[PDB]
Backbone:
């Protein structure tokens, strides 16, 4: 029993965190084999950040201008290339603690763990989701840049995110490990705004299935709905459109609890129109949307790495 | 900016997780130097659990009756003593990954990270608090016994908990790393009931101070209160009695925001009265009580908004 927001064990990722210093700027780097990966905004000053020319700024820096530090040991940079918005620093020494890894670009609604670091030193780990508006509601202070988002599948760490900047509304924006931003964001000092967010419908549904598994059945009713009638209501409450793929993915949960996906959709429809009414599902007065159908099956089965 | 429930990086604790097997039973163990620590109910059967005589059951066991397994390698037990409710297995190999550690007994209202394991294999990490009724609302399935609660302050891992059992209401009971239970609980399958829980007042207060630091002030009012008048009202909403120690501990936060502790108490008194009224403090429709005054100072910046 029990339902908590859980993150993957951060150990494999902790062994990859280094501190990258370039002039006055100091952020975090990801050391895998003989390459350190970090935001390309490390070469930038606060003057350069308005309209930067990253290729012109990189052609001027030599290897020793970048001080990479792994714990108490210094690392020797022997090369520097750039891939989109990530700077790839070839180092002399291969990381002996390199885990089995992959670089993956995740889709909105998919969750990941964030190992928040400051000066190459891990300080915390938390779980979060890629919002429909490509932002992440993370917890970051200055100097957290270069912190990574990951998921472990068996013994393989799948790197899916690197922190770059925080938006004016308190939300965060970063890139996949290939430098490609998540969303309509750019790495520079400009008027950037987070779009209108939506609730991840397939995750709320999965979280209600976890509540039924954990003994909460008060929100269930005898009624069901058509996928179309559900989507019209969902659209009115800023919910993401539920697709036939979403329905199929909730299949294992539907079979385990004994409540059809469109039966559970009707419970959610009535929770949107009428509310909680002083009650809580899984200890929450809000409908939680950062638990994917896989996350629920993992926590309510016991998958080990 | 940003406020999330954060857990400590689990890496230092991952390297200590072994699998303890004694006959048909298999739970988790904590391997520090040449000692493996695990629940003493590993020696028990489901028959023995009603009224076990642990001394009589241990004297019938030889070192080979225990199979400790560290990853793919088998460990050789060369001793077996018992300390309260924890079984201490002397092994023939010291853990090369033993971190700098301490054993600490925490008090209610304090928070810690939990590395949930199954068959010595870490599967997830989450943050939780020692409830006023000595239980923890964790996320544990069968076979998670022996999972530990920790706090990593600086480079030292402070071990404060070991999972022993799950009560009928779905809450969890465990011991400190010396085998001493938290609460009026016994490692016996008897009619044990979790006491009436209360909200941790000093943590809700700290969480409101973090909201003020992060820019929210809607909940504040012009009223103030006496410590006594606050406690009478608090006890009505099942809130923990606020003590003069609690007030002092909130001192640094009181100075940083510029809102006296009894001023913040009167904002909470009103919040308990009218409720949220469709609004949220730090992204929550409930008053969060699993952030200690120390957690808030740790996570939040010194720059108030
Ligand atoms: C022998 C362990 C056991 C237990 O609670 N196991 C568990 C621990 N944590 C999560 C669980 C989730 C589901 C199933 C069991 C869980 C078994 N139940 S009992 O009442 O006999 C019992 C009584 C006292 C002690 Cl200290 C242990 C135990
Ligand atoms: Cl304490």
Residues:
């Amino acid at each position: 029993s029990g339902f908590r927001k859980m993150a993957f064990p951060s150990g494999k990722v902790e062994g990859c965190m280094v501190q990258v210093t370039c002039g006055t700027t100091t952020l975090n780097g990801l050391w895998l084999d003989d390459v350190v990966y970090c935001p390309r905004h490390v070469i930038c000053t606060s003057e350069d950040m308005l309209n930067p020319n990253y290729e012109d700024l990189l052609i001027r820096k030599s290897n020793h201008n970048f001080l990479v530090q792994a714990g108490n040991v210094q690392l020797r940079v022997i090369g520097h290339s750039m891939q989109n918005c990530v700077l790839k620093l070839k180092v002399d020494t291969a990381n002996p603690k390199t885990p089995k890894y992959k670089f993956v670009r995740i889709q909105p609604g998919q969750t990941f763990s964030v190992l928040a670091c400051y000066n190459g030193s891990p300080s915390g780990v938390y779980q979060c989701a890629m919002r429909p508006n490509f932002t992440i509601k993370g917890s970051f202070l200055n100097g957290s840049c270069g912190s990574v988002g990951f998921n472990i599948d068996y013994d393989c760490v799948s790197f899916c995110y690197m922190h770059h900047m925080e938006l004016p509304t308190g939300v965060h924006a970063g890139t996949d490990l290939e430098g490609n931003f998540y969303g309509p964001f750019v790495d520079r000092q400009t008027a950037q705004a987070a779009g209108t967010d939506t609730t991840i419908t397939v995750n709320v549904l999965a979280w209600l299935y976890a509540a039924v598994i954990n003994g909460d059945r008060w929100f269930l009713n005898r009624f069901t709905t058509t996928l179309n009638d559900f989507n019209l209501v969902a659209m009115k409450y800023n919910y993401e459109p539920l697709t036939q793929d979403h329905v199929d993915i909730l299949g294992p949960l539907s079979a385990q609890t004994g409540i059809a996906v469109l039966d559970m959709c009707a419970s959610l429809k009535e929770l949107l129109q009428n509310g909680m009414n002083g009650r809580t599902i899984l200890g929450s007065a809000l409908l939680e949307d950062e638990f994917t159908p896989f996350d629920v099956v993992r926590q309510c089965s016991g998958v080990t790495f």
